[PDB]
Design a protein around this motif. Structure first.
Motif, mmCIF file in Angstrom:
data_model
loop_
_atom_site.group_PDB
_atom_site.id
_atom_site.type_symbol
_atom_site.label_atom_id
_atom_site.label_comp_id
_atom_site.label_asym_id
_atom_site.label_seq_id
_atom_site.Cartn_x
_atom_site.Cartn_y
_atom_site.Cartn_z
ATOM 1 N N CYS A 96 1.438 3.465 1.930
ATOM 2 C CA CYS A 96 1.999 3.815 3.226
ATOM 3 C C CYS A 96 2.861 2.665 3.749
ATOM 4 N N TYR A 121 2.167 0.508 6.148
ATOM 5 C CA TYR A 121 1.421 -0.500 6.889
ATOM 6 C C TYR A 121 2.032 -1.885 6.686
ATOM 7 N N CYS A 137 0.840 -1.179 0.000
ATOM 8 C CA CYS A 137 0.000 0.000 0.000
ATOM 9 C C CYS A 137 0.884 1.242 0.000
ATOM 10 N N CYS A 176 -4.550 2.307 0.264
ATOM 11 C CA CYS A 176 -4.660 1.949 1.672
ATOM 12 C C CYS A 176 -6.055 1.442 2.011
ATOM 13 N N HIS A 192 -5.915 -2.502 3.372
ATOM 14 C CA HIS A 192 -6.175 -2.565 4.812
ATOM 15 C C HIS A 192 -7.300 -1.604 5.178
#
Ligand SMILES: [Zn+2]
Ligand SMILES: [Zn+2]
Ligand SMILES: [Zn+2]
Length: 77
Positions: A36, A38, A34, A72, A76
Motif C-alpha cells: 500500500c 503507507y 509495503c 502491510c 506496519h
C-alpha cells in the motif's frame, strides 16, 4: 591496567575489522515498501558499527533488524 577487549566485525569490503567502540543504537533511515501507500520510519532495532579496517582504514556502517519490505502486517502492524 587491564586490557579492554573490543569485538570484531566484517567490513563492507568483507575483511575482518576491529571495532573501536561497542555497537550503539541509531535511527534507521531505510524506506519501507509495503503493498500500500503507507509512509513511515523503521522503528529499528538498528545499530551502528565503528571500526578501523586494515584495508579501508576508519569506516562505519549501520545494520537493522526491522522489517523494511513485506506485507502491510509485517512492515506496519
Ligand atoms: Zn574494509
Ligand atoms: Zn530498519
Ligand atoms: Zn501497508
Amino acid at each position: 591496567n587491564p586490557n579492554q577487549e573490543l569485538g570484531v566485525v566484517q567490513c563492507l569490503c568483507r575483511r575482518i575489522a576491529p571495532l573501536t567502540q561497542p555497537p550503539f543504537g541509531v535511527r534507521c533511515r531505510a524506506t519501507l515498501n509495503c503493498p500500500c501507500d503507507y509512509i513511515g520510519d523503521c522503528p529499528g532495532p538498528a545499530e551502528q558499527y565503528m571500526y578501523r579496517c586494515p584495508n579501508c582504514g576508519p569506516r562505519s556502517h549501520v545494520a537493522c533488524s526491522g522489517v523494511h519490505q513485506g506485507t502491510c502486517q509485517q512492515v506496519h502492524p
